[PDB]
Paper text:
LipS assumes the fold of a classical α/β hydrolase. The active site of LipS is formed by the catalytic triad S126, D227 and H257 with the catalytic serine located at the sharp γ-turn between β4 and αD. The position of the catalytic triad and the oxyanion hole (F58 and M127) at conserved topological sites clearly designates this newly characterized enzyme as a hydrolase.
LipS displayed a dimeric character during purification by size exclusion chromatography. Consistent with this observation, the asymmetric units of LipS in SG P4 and P42212 contain one and two identical dimers, respectively. In the higher resolution SG P4, there is clear additional electron density immediately adjacent to the catalytic S126 and H257. In LipS in SG P42212, however, there is no such electron density. We interpreted this residual density with spermidine, which was added during crystallization of LipS in SG P4 but not in SG P42212. Furthermore, data that the inserted domain assumes the same conformation with and without bound spermidine in structures of LipS suggests that this is rather a rigid structure. Identical conformations of the lid-domain, which covers the active site, in the absence and presence of a ligand, indicate that this domain may not undergo conformational rearrangements during the catalytic cycle.
Author numbering:
A (entry chain B): 35 to 284
B (entry chain A): 35 to 286
Amino acid sequence: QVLPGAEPLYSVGSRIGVLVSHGFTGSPQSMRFLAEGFARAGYTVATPRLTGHGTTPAEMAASTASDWTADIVAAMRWLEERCDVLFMTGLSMGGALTVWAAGQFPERFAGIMPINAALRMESPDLAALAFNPDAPAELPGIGSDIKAEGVKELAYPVTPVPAIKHLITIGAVAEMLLPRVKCPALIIQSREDHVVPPHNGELIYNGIGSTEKELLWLENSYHVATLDNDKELILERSLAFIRKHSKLAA
Amino acid sequence: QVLPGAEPLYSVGSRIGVLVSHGFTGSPQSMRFLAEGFARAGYTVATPRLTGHGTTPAEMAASTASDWTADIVAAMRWLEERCDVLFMTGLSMGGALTVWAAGQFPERFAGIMPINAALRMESPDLAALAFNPDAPAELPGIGSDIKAEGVKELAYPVTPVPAIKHLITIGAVAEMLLPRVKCPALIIQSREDHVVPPHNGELIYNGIGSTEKELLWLENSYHVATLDNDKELILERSLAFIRKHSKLAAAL
Ligand SMILES: [Br-]
Ligand SMILES: [Br-]
Protein backbone atom coordinates (compact mmCIF):
# COMPACT_ATOMS: atom_id res chain seq x y z
CA GLN A 1 0.00 0.00 0.00
CA VAL A 2 1.09 3.57 -0.58
CA LEU A 3 0.96 6.13 2.22
CA PRO A 4 -1.43 9.01 1.59
CA GLY A 5 0.00 12.19 0.01
CA ALA A 6 2.95 10.16 -1.34
CA GLU A 7 1.35 8.81 -4.54
CA PRO A 8 3.31 9.54 -7.72
CA LEU A 9 2.33 12.50 -9.87
CA TYR A 10 2.37 12.48 -13.71
CA SER A 11 0.59 15.38 -15.57
CA VAL A 12 0.26 15.33 -19.43
CA GLY A 13 1.15 18.62 -21.19
CA SER A 14 3.05 20.02 -24.10
CA ARG A 15 6.03 18.59 -25.94
CA ILE A 16 8.06 19.99 -23.03
CA GLY A 17 8.69 17.66 -20.06
CA VAL A 18 10.00 18.04 -16.52
CA LEU A 19 11.35 15.14 -14.49
CA VAL A 20 10.95 15.95 -10.81
CA SER A 21 12.72 13.79 -8.25
CA HIS A 22 12.21 13.28 -4.50
CA GLY A 23 14.86 12.49 -1.91
CA PHE A 24 15.98 9.69 0.34
CA THR A 25 13.38 8.40 2.88
CA GLY A 26 11.05 11.03 1.39
CA SER A 27 8.15 11.00 -1.02
CA PRO A 28 6.88 13.01 -3.99
CA GLN A 29 4.86 15.13 -1.59
CA SER A 30 7.95 17.05 -0.59
CA MET A 31 7.88 17.75 -4.30
CA ARG A 32 4.14 18.06 -4.89
CA PHE A 33 4.11 21.87 -4.77
CA LEU A 34 6.81 22.18 -7.34
CA ALA A 35 5.58 19.50 -9.67
CA GLU A 36 2.14 21.06 -9.65
CA GLY A 37 3.42 24.48 -10.70
CA PHE A 38 5.05 22.90 -13.71
CA ALA A 39 1.89 20.97 -14.68
CA ARG A 40 0.15 24.36 -14.71
CA ALA A 41 2.31 26.20 -17.19
CA GLY A 42 1.24 23.11 -19.15
CA TYR A 43 4.45 21.10 -19.33
CA THR A 44 4.22 17.31 -19.18
CA VAL A 45 5.36 16.38 -15.67
CA ALA A 46 6.76 13.21 -14.19
CA THR A 47 7.25 12.92 -10.44
CA PRO A 48 8.05 9.29 -9.75
CA ARG A 49 7.78 7.58 -6.40
CA LEU A 50 11.17 5.87 -5.94
CA THR A 51 11.15 2.14 -5.07
CA GLY A 52 10.83 1.40 -1.32
CA HIS A 53 9.62 4.95 -0.73
CA GLY A 54 6.25 6.13 0.59
CA THR A 55 5.40 2.59 1.66
CA THR A 56 7.25 0.84 4.54
CA PRO A 57 10.79 1.38 5.86
CA ALA A 58 11.46 -2.37 5.54
CA GLU A 59 10.65 -2.31 1.83
CA MET A 60 13.14 0.59 1.51
CA ALA A 61 15.72 -1.49 3.35
CA ALA A 62 15.49 -3.89 0.40
CA SER A 63 15.84 -1.20 -2.33
CA THR A 64 19.03 -0.35 -4.20
CA ALA A 65 20.68 2.40 -6.11
CA SER A 66 20.05 0.24 -9.24
CA ASP A 67 16.34 0.40 -8.45
CA TRP A 68 16.28 4.17 -7.99
CA THR A 69 18.25 4.91 -11.12
CA ALA A 70 15.95 2.52 -13.01
CA ASP A 71 12.98 4.57 -11.62
CA ILE A 72 14.51 7.72 -13.05
CA VAL A 73 15.13 6.06 -16.42
CA ALA A 74 11.53 4.71 -16.63
CA ALA A 75 10.41 8.28 -15.93
CA MET A 76 12.50 9.63 -18.84
CA ARG A 77 11.11 6.96 -21.15
CA TRP A 78 7.58 7.94 -20.20
CA LEU A 79 8.46 11.55 -20.84
CA GLU A 80 10.21 10.78 -24.13
CA GLU A 81 6.96 9.42 -25.54
CA ARG A 82 5.37 12.81 -25.12
CA CYS A 83 8.17 15.30 -25.50
CA ASP A 84 11.07 16.48 -27.67
CA VAL A 85 12.60 18.66 -24.93
CA LEU A 86 13.29 17.46 -21.36
CA PHE A 87 14.38 18.97 -18.03
CA MET A 88 15.20 17.56 -14.65
CA THR A 89 15.07 18.77 -11.10
CA GLY A 90 15.37 17.04 -7.78
CA LEU A 91 15.99 17.59 -4.17
CA SER A 92 18.76 16.21 -2.07
CA MET A 93 19.46 12.62 -3.34
CA GLY A 94 16.94 13.46 -6.05
CA GLY A 95 19.30 16.33 -6.91
CA ALA A 96 22.19 13.86 -7.01
CA LEU A 97 20.05 11.86 -9.42
CA THR A 98 19.55 14.94 -11.54
CA VAL A 99 23.31 15.46 -11.79
CA TRP A 100 23.56 11.77 -12.60
CA ALA A 101 20.96 11.82 -15.37
CA ALA A 102 22.45 14.85 -17.12
CA GLY A 103 25.84 13.13 -17.01
CA GLN A 104 24.77 9.60 -17.89
CA PHE A 105 22.81 10.97 -20.83
CA PRO A 106 25.04 13.91 -21.80
CA GLU A 107 22.65 15.12 -24.55
CA ARG A 108 19.19 14.16 -23.34
CA PHE A 109 18.23 17.18 -21.25
CA ALA A 110 17.85 20.81 -22.20
CA GLY A 111 18.68 22.00 -18.67
CA ILE A 112 18.74 20.83 -15.05
CA MET A 113 17.77 22.25 -11.65
CA PRO A 114 19.52 20.48 -8.74
CA ILE A 115 18.36 21.68 -5.34
CA ASN A 116 20.49 20.82 -2.33
CA ALA A 117 21.95 17.87 -4.25
CA ALA A 118 23.25 15.11 -1.92
CA LEU A 119 26.66 14.66 -3.56
CA ARG A 120 28.82 14.54 -0.47
CA MET A 121 27.18 13.94 2.84
CA GLU A 122 30.51 14.70 4.47
CA SER A 123 29.56 12.76 7.63
CA PRO A 124 31.79 10.06 9.10
CA ASP A 125 29.05 8.79 11.35
CA LEU A 126 26.95 7.97 8.32
CA ALA A 127 29.75 6.17 6.56
CA ALA A 128 30.29 4.07 9.67
CA LEU A 129 26.79 2.63 9.08
CA ALA A 130 27.22 1.75 5.39
CA PHE A 131 28.91 -1.66 5.94
CA ASN A 132 28.71 -2.08 9.71
CA PRO A 133 27.90 -5.77 10.55
CA ASP A 134 26.58 -4.96 14.06
CA ALA A 135 24.37 -1.99 13.24
CA PRO A 136 20.72 -1.92 14.29
CA ALA A 137 18.14 -2.17 11.54
CA GLU A 138 16.73 1.32 12.08
CA LEU A 139 17.92 4.83 13.09
CA PRO A 140 16.26 8.18 13.61
CA GLY A 141 14.99 9.73 10.30
CA ILE A 142 16.44 12.91 8.80
CA GLY A 143 13.42 14.78 7.42
CA SER A 144 11.57 18.01 8.33
CA ASP A 145 14.62 20.28 8.07
CA ILE A 146 12.59 23.42 7.34
CA LYS A 147 12.60 27.10 8.52
CA ALA A 148 8.84 27.70 8.09
CA GLU A 149 6.45 26.99 11.02
CA GLY A 150 4.31 23.85 11.42
CA VAL A 151 5.47 22.65 8.00
CA LYS A 152 5.79 18.81 8.12
CA GLU A 153 7.48 16.69 5.40
CA LEU A 154 5.97 13.28 4.78
CA ALA A 155 9.18 11.23 5.13
CA TYR A 156 9.87 7.99 7.04
CA PRO A 157 10.50 8.45 10.78
CA VAL A 158 13.40 5.93 10.70
CA THR A 159 16.49 5.83 8.44
CA PRO A 160 16.67 2.18 7.31
CA VAL A 161 20.39 1.48 7.71
CA PRO A 162 20.95 -1.03 5.00
CA ALA A 163 20.04 1.63 2.36
CA ILE A 164 22.59 4.17 3.49
CA LYS A 165 25.31 2.76 1.23
CA HIS A 166 23.12 3.42 -1.80
CA LEU A 167 22.66 7.07 -0.95
CA ILE A 168 26.45 7.38 -0.78
CA THR A 169 27.01 5.64 -4.10
CA ILE A 170 24.63 7.93 -6.02
CA GLY A 171 26.34 10.97 -4.49
CA ALA A 172 29.77 9.67 -5.43
CA VAL A 173 28.86 8.54 -8.95
CA ALA A 174 27.12 11.84 -9.51
CA GLU A 175 30.17 13.81 -8.41
CA MET A 176 32.46 11.77 -10.64
CA LEU A 177 30.29 12.55 -13.69
CA LEU A 178 30.32 16.34 -13.15
CA PRO A 179 32.69 17.01 -16.07
CA ARG A 180 30.27 15.41 -18.55
CA VAL A 181 27.28 17.51 -17.65
CA LYS A 182 26.99 19.92 -20.62
CA CYS A 183 23.47 21.37 -20.46
CA PRO A 184 22.56 24.66 -18.79
CA ALA A 185 22.33 24.40 -14.99
CA LEU A 186 20.60 26.44 -12.33
CA ILE A 187 22.04 25.05 -9.14
CA ILE A 188 19.83 25.61 -6.11
CA GLN A 189 21.49 25.52 -2.66
CA SER A 190 20.27 26.73 0.81
CA ARG A 191 22.59 29.16 2.60
CA GLU A 192 22.09 27.06 5.74
CA ASP A 193 21.49 23.29 5.42
CA HIS A 194 21.49 21.01 8.39
CA VAL A 195 21.35 17.86 6.27
CA VAL A 196 23.62 18.46 3.33
CA PRO A 197 26.84 20.49 3.49
CA PRO A 198 26.00 23.53 1.31
CA HIS A 199 29.49 23.35 -0.07
CA ASN A 200 27.75 20.99 -2.44
CA GLY A 201 26.43 23.94 -4.49
CA GLU A 202 29.98 25.26 -5.07
CA LEU A 203 31.28 21.73 -5.72
CA ILE A 204 28.80 21.42 -8.57
CA TYR A 205 29.44 24.94 -9.96
CA ASN A 206 33.19 24.29 -10.30
CA GLY A 207 32.78 20.71 -11.48
CA ILE A 208 30.31 20.80 -14.38
CA GLY A 209 31.37 21.12 -18.03
CA SER A 210 28.53 23.56 -18.71
CA THR A 211 29.06 27.09 -19.95
CA GLU A 212 25.48 28.10 -18.99
CA LYS A 213 25.58 27.70 -15.22
CA GLU A 214 24.21 29.82 -12.34
CA LEU A 215 24.24 29.26 -8.53
CA LEU A 216 21.17 30.50 -6.62
CA TRP A 217 21.66 30.70 -2.76
CA LEU A 218 18.43 30.30 -0.76
CA GLU A 219 17.89 32.62 2.17
CA ASN A 220 14.85 31.79 4.31
CA SER A 221 15.08 28.07 3.75
CA TYR A 222 16.82 25.01 5.13
CA HIS A 223 17.24 21.62 3.48
CA VAL A 224 13.77 20.60 2.40
CA ALA A 225 13.37 23.85 0.45
CA THR A 226 10.57 22.87 -1.89
CA LEU A 227 8.27 22.97 1.19
CA ASP A 228 9.96 25.98 2.76
CA ASN A 229 9.08 29.62 2.39
CA ASP A 230 11.80 30.24 -0.12
CA LYS A 231 9.88 27.75 -2.34
CA GLU A 232 7.61 29.97 -4.41
CA LEU A 233 10.76 31.64 -5.57
CA ILE A 234 12.25 28.28 -6.66
CA LEU A 235 9.22 27.44 -8.80
CA GLU A 236 9.39 30.92 -10.15
CA ARG A 237 13.08 31.03 -10.93
CA SER A 238 12.83 27.51 -12.35
CA LEU A 239 10.13 28.47 -14.87
CA ALA A 240 12.21 31.34 -16.15
CA PHE A 241 14.94 28.71 -16.64
CA ILE A 242 12.83 26.33 -18.62
CA ARG A 243 11.64 29.22 -20.91
CA LYS A 244 15.02 30.71 -21.71
CA HIS A 245 16.29 27.33 -22.84
CA SER A 246 13.33 25.52 -24.34
CA LYS A 247 12.17 28.12 -26.77
CA LEU A 248 8.97 26.04 -27.44
CA ALA A 249 5.45 27.01 -26.36
CA ALA A 250 7.00 29.20 -23.69
CA GLN B 1 37.52 -23.74 -9.35
CA VAL B 2 40.09 -21.29 -8.21
CA LEU B 3 42.63 -20.28 -10.80
CA PRO B 4 46.26 -21.35 -10.24
CA GLY B 5 48.18 -18.94 -8.00
CA ALA B 6 45.27 -16.99 -6.73
CA GLU B 7 44.51 -19.04 -3.58
CA PRO B 8 44.56 -17.11 -0.26
CA LEU B 9 47.61 -16.99 1.92
CA TYR B 10 46.65 -17.90 5.51
CA SER B 11 49.87 -18.15 7.56
CA VAL B 12 50.32 -18.78 11.30
CA GLY B 13 52.76 -17.10 13.69
CA SER B 14 53.07 -14.72 16.57
CA ARG B 15 50.47 -12.61 18.44
CA ILE B 16 50.81 -9.84 15.91
CA GLY B 17 48.47 -10.18 12.93
CA VAL B 18 48.57 -8.62 9.47
CA LEU B 19 45.63 -8.58 7.15
CA VAL B 20 46.62 -8.03 3.49
CA SER B 21 44.01 -7.15 0.89
CA HIS B 22 44.23 -7.33 -2.85
CA GLY B 23 42.47 -5.24 -5.45
CA PHE B 24 39.65 -5.12 -7.94
CA THR B 25 39.74 -7.91 -10.57
CA GLY B 26 42.99 -8.82 -8.77
CA SER B 27 43.95 -11.76 -6.58
CA PRO B 28 46.29 -12.73 -3.74
CA GLN B 29 49.02 -13.50 -6.28
CA SER B 30 49.57 -9.81 -6.59
CA MET B 31 50.15 -9.63 -2.82
CA ARG B 32 52.16 -12.85 -2.40
CA PHE B 33 55.48 -11.11 -2.08
CA LEU B 34 54.27 -8.97 0.87
CA ALA B 35 52.37 -11.69 2.70
CA GLU B 36 55.07 -14.36 2.46
CA GLY B 37 57.35 -11.58 3.70
CA PHE B 38 55.29 -11.07 6.88
CA ALA B 39 54.78 -14.81 7.52
CA ARG B 40 58.50 -15.16 7.39
CA ALA B 41 59.08 -12.31 9.82
CA GLY B 42 57.12 -14.24 12.49
CA TYR B 43 53.64 -12.69 12.32
CA THR B 44 50.28 -14.43 11.72
CA VAL B 45 48.92 -13.38 8.36
CA ALA B 46 45.64 -13.40 6.51
CA THR B 47 45.53 -12.73 2.77
CA PRO B 48 41.95 -13.48 1.77
CA ARG B 49 40.53 -14.26 -1.66
CA LEU B 50 37.84 -11.57 -2.16
CA THR B 51 34.47 -13.00 -3.19
CA GLY B 52 34.18 -13.41 -6.98
CA HIS B 53 37.88 -12.95 -7.45
CA GLY B 54 40.35 -15.42 -8.85
CA THR B 55 37.66 -17.54 -10.42
CA THR B 56 35.55 -16.09 -13.25
CA PRO B 57 34.48 -12.54 -14.29
CA ALA B 58 30.90 -13.77 -14.26
CA GLU B 59 31.15 -14.66 -10.57
CA MET B 60 32.75 -11.29 -9.83
CA ALA B 61 29.90 -9.60 -11.77
CA ALA B 62 27.54 -11.19 -9.24
CA SER B 63 29.60 -10.07 -6.15
CA THR B 64 28.99 -6.84 -4.20
CA ALA B 65 30.68 -4.36 -1.92
CA SER B 66 28.80 -6.08 0.99
CA ASP B 67 30.61 -9.32 0.16
CA TRP B 68 34.04 -7.71 0.13
CA THR B 69 33.65 -5.76 3.40
CA ALA B 70 32.27 -8.97 4.96
CA ASP B 71 35.37 -10.88 3.57
CA ILE B 72 37.73 -8.43 5.25
CA VAL B 73 35.66 -8.79 8.41
CA ALA B 74 35.87 -12.58 8.34
CA ALA B 75 39.62 -12.49 7.92
CA MET B 76 39.96 -9.93 10.67
CA ARG B 77 38.01 -12.17 13.04
CA TRP B 78 40.21 -15.08 12.04
CA LEU B 79 43.22 -13.12 13.24
CA GLU B 80 41.55 -12.14 16.47
CA GLU B 81 41.24 -15.87 17.19
CA ARG B 82 45.07 -15.84 17.70
CA CYS B 83 46.09 -12.22 17.90
CA ASP B 84 45.91 -9.18 20.01
CA VAL B 85 47.89 -6.72 17.91
CA LEU B 86 46.47 -6.07 14.42
CA PHE B 87 47.83 -4.33 11.32
CA MET B 88 46.21 -3.79 7.88
CA THR B 89 47.65 -3.35 4.43
CA GLY B 90 46.13 -3.50 0.95
CA LEU B 91 46.67 -2.54 -2.66
CA SER B 92 44.35 -0.35 -4.65
CA MET B 93 40.77 -1.25 -3.66
CA GLY B 94 42.55 -3.26 -0.96
CA GLY B 95 43.92 0.15 0.00
CA ALA B 96 40.44 1.52 0.39
CA LEU B 97 39.29 -1.43 2.44
CA THR B 98 42.29 -0.78 4.69
CA VAL B 99 41.28 2.84 5.24
CA TRP B 100 37.68 1.68 5.55
CA ALA B 101 38.59 -0.84 8.20
CA ALA B 102 40.64 1.60 10.19
CA GLY B 103 37.71 3.96 10.22
CA GLN B 104 35.05 1.32 10.79
CA PHE B 105 36.94 -0.19 13.69
CA PRO B 106 38.72 2.86 15.17
CA GLU B 107 40.30 0.99 18.14
CA ARG B 108 41.04 -2.32 16.48
CA PHE B 109 44.22 -1.52 14.52
CA ALA B 110 47.77 -0.67 15.64
CA GLY B 111 48.57 0.53 12.09
CA ILE B 112 47.69 0.79 8.43
CA MET B 113 49.73 0.78 5.22
CA PRO B 114 47.49 1.71 2.36
CA ILE B 115 49.27 1.25 -0.99
CA ASN B 116 47.70 3.28 -3.81
CA ALA B 117 44.32 3.50 -2.17
CA ALA B 118 41.55 3.54 -4.79
CA LEU B 119 39.51 6.26 -3.01
CA ARG B 120 38.67 8.60 -5.88
CA MET B 121 39.08 7.09 -9.28
CA GLU B 122 38.27 10.43 -10.79
CA SER B 123 37.23 8.97 -14.12
CA PRO B 124 33.99 10.18 -15.74
CA ASP B 125 33.94 7.17 -18.10
CA LEU B 126 33.94 4.62 -15.31
CA ALA B 127 31.13 6.44 -13.55
CA ALA B 128 29.05 6.43 -16.70
CA LEU B 129 29.25 2.67 -16.46
CA ALA B 130 28.16 2.44 -12.85
CA PHE B 131 24.42 2.34 -13.65
CA ASN B 132 24.37 2.05 -17.40
CA PRO B 133 21.31 0.16 -18.73
CA ASP B 134 22.91 -0.26 -22.18
CA ALA B 135 26.52 -0.94 -21.41
CA PRO B 136 28.10 -4.19 -22.39
CA ALA B 137 28.71 -6.90 -19.83
CA GLU B 138 32.46 -6.64 -20.23
CA LEU B 139 35.15 -4.06 -20.82
CA PRO B 140 38.90 -4.41 -21.12
CA GLY B 141 40.44 -5.09 -17.67
CA ILE B 142 42.64 -2.64 -15.75
CA GLY B 143 45.42 -5.01 -14.51
CA SER B 144 49.23 -4.93 -14.84
CA ASP B 145 50.32 -1.28 -14.53
CA ILE B 146 54.02 -1.97 -13.82
CA LYS B 147 57.15 0.08 -14.67
CA ALA B 148 59.21 -3.07 -14.45
CA GLU B 149 59.96 -4.81 -17.71
CA GLY B 150 58.74 -8.44 -17.99
CA VAL B 151 56.50 -8.52 -14.86
CA LYS B 152 52.80 -9.53 -15.27
CA GLU B 153 49.93 -9.45 -12.64
CA LEU B 154 47.24 -12.23 -12.50
CA ALA B 155 44.11 -10.03 -12.93
CA TYR B 156 41.06 -10.83 -14.99
CA PRO B 157 41.47 -9.78 -18.64
CA VAL B 158 38.10 -8.06 -18.52
CA THR B 159 36.39 -5.69 -16.09
CA PRO B 160 32.83 -6.87 -15.36
CA VAL B 161 30.57 -3.88 -15.72
CA PRO B 162 28.06 -4.54 -12.93
CA ALA B 163 30.82 -4.65 -10.28
CA ILE B 164 32.06 -1.12 -11.10
CA LYS B 165 29.61 0.62 -8.74
CA HIS B 166 30.76 -1.41 -5.77
CA LEU B 167 34.33 -0.28 -6.49
CA ILE B 168 33.20 3.39 -6.31
CA THR B 169 31.11 2.78 -3.18
CA ILE B 170 34.07 1.38 -1.28
CA GLY B 171 36.20 4.33 -2.42
CA ALA B 172 33.65 6.87 -1.32
CA VAL B 173 32.85 5.28 2.08
CA ALA B 174 36.58 5.10 2.89
CA GLU B 175 36.92 8.76 1.93
CA MET B 176 34.11 9.86 4.19
CA LEU B 177 35.66 7.80 7.06
CA LEU B 178 39.14 9.51 6.98
CA PRO B 179 38.34 11.79 9.90
CA ARG B 180 37.88 8.68 12.15
CA VAL B 181 41.09 6.86 11.30
CA LYS B 182 43.34 7.89 14.22
CA CYS B 183 45.94 5.14 14.11
CA PRO B 184 49.46 5.27 12.76
CA ALA B 185 49.60 5.29 8.95
CA LEU B 186 52.19 4.63 6.32
CA ILE B 187 50.72 6.00 3.12
CA ILE B 188 52.41 4.52 0.11
CA GLN B 189 51.45 6.18 -3.15
CA SER B 190 53.37 5.88 -6.48
CA ARG B 191 54.40 9.12 -8.20
CA GLU B 192 53.50 7.64 -11.58
CA ASP B 193 50.16 5.83 -11.53
CA HIS B 194 47.99 5.09 -14.55
CA VAL B 195 45.11 3.35 -12.75
CA VAL B 196 44.44 5.39 -9.57
CA PRO B 197 45.27 9.13 -9.58
CA PRO B 198 48.36 9.60 -7.48
CA HIS B 199 46.97 12.65 -5.72
CA ASN B 200 44.99 10.11 -3.64
CA GLY B 201 47.92 9.88 -1.20
CA GLU B 202 47.73 13.59 -0.56
CA LEU B 203 43.97 13.20 -0.16
CA ILE B 204 44.69 10.70 2.69
CA TYR B 205 47.56 12.46 4.51
CA ASN B 206 45.47 15.60 4.88
CA GLY B 207 42.31 13.59 5.48
CA ILE B 208 43.02 11.45 8.54
CA GLY B 209 42.63 12.46 12.19
CA SER B 210 45.60 10.16 12.71
CA THR B 211 48.50 11.98 14.29
CA GLU B 212 51.25 9.58 13.39
CA LYS B 213 51.16 9.85 9.65
CA GLU B 214 53.75 9.47 6.96
CA LEU B 215 53.44 9.97 3.14
CA LEU B 216 55.91 7.88 1.17
CA TRP B 217 56.32 8.48 -2.56
CA LEU B 218 57.35 5.59 -4.76
CA GLU B 219 59.55 6.72 -7.67
CA ASN B 220 60.41 3.54 -9.60
CA SER B 221 56.93 2.13 -9.92
CA TYR B 222 53.40 2.36 -11.24
CA HIS B 223 50.01 1.37 -9.78
CA VAL B 224 50.57 -2.33 -9.05
CA ALA B 225 53.58 -1.48 -6.88
CA THR B 226 53.55 -4.63 -4.75
CA LEU B 227 55.28 -6.25 -7.74
CA ASP B 228 57.01 -3.33 -9.38
CA ASN B 229 60.63 -2.54 -8.73
CA ASP B 230 59.85 -1.37 -5.22
CA LYS B 231 58.12 -4.41 -3.90
CA GLU B 232 61.21 -5.08 -1.84
CA LEU B 233 61.39 -1.55 -0.63
CA ILE B 234 57.75 -1.75 0.51
CA LEU B 235 58.11 -4.99 2.50
CA GLU B 236 61.10 -3.57 4.22
CA ARG B 237 59.61 -0.14 5.03
CA SER B 238 56.50 -1.96 6.33
CA LEU B 239 58.46 -4.17 8.76
CA ALA B 240 60.12 -1.11 10.27
CA PHE B 241 56.58 0.25 10.66
CA ILE B 242 55.15 -2.84 12.39
CA ARG B 243 58.28 -3.22 14.54
CA LYS B 244 58.11 0.53 15.41
CA HIS B 245 54.53 0.52 16.61
CA SER B 246 53.92 -2.89 18.16
CA LYS B 247 56.84 -3.30 20.58
CA LEU B 248 55.61 -6.97 21.03
CA ALA B 249 57.88 -7.85 18.08
CA ALA B 250 61.14 -9.51 19.33
CA ALA B 251 62.95 -10.91 16.14
CA LEU B 252 66.52 -12.31 15.82
BR1 LIG C 1 22.52 11.11 -24.47
BR1 LIG D 1 36.83 -0.74 17.23
